[PDB]
């Protein structure tokens, strides 16, 4: 027990200003700089087809759940050195919570 639920509305706007530049979240949403993340929970890293991911991400083979997604979110290059994900992070657990509450919801 280490992840508690945030606000999806607050999650959704965090997403629009911090992740939209690179990702789509809708079913059948296209890949961009970053891959489409629909269905990410339960899935492992580097398995969306039609996307060229770094060695590092495939290699890490992380099961995508809220718990994991939080630490990746804090510092991705940290969590997975070699990732091409150019994002500093979300150091605030509160923001992280909203946002994950949002992804838990839309990538559904």
SS3 state of residue 65:
coil
Tokens standing for 63?
A: 């099961």
Query: What are phi and psi for residue 63, nearest 5 degrees?
Result: -85, 130
62, 72 contact by CB (below 8 A):
yes
Q: Does 31 bind ligand HEC (CB under 6 A)?
A: no
Asked if 8 touches ligand HEC (CB under 6 A), the answer is no
39 C-beta neighbours (distance < 10 Å), count: 14
**Angle (CA) 67 13 98, round 5°:** 25
The interface with ligand HEC within residues 78-107 (CB under 6 A) comprises 83-87, 90, 103
Site string for ligand HEC, 44-83 (x = CB under 6 A): -xx-x----xx-xx-----------x-------------x
Binds ligand HEC by CB under 6 A, chosen from 6, 8, 19, 79: 19
* Residues 85 and 77 sit within 8 Å (Cβ to Cβ): yes
Binding-site residues, please? 19, 22-23, 85
Give me the residues that bind ligand HEC (CB under 6 A), please: 18-19, 21-23, 33-35, 37, 40, 45-46, 48, 53-54, 56-57, 69, 83-87, 90, 103
Binding-site residues for heme c, please? 19, 22-23, 85
């Amino acid at each position: 027990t280490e992840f508690k639920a945030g606000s999806a509305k607050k999650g959704a706007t965090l997403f629009k200003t911090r992740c939209l530049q690179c990702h789509t979240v809708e079913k059948g949403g296209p890949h961009k700089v970053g891959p489409n993340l629909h269905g990410i929970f339960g899935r492992h890293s580097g398995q969306a087809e039609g996307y060229s991911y770094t060695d590092a991400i495939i290699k890490k083979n992380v099961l995508w759940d809220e718990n994991n997604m939080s630490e990746y979110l804090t510092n991705p290059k940290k969590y997975i050195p070699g990732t091409k994900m150019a994002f500093g992070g979300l150091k605030k657990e509160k923001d992280r919570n909203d946002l994950i509450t949002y992804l838990k919801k839309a990538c559904e």
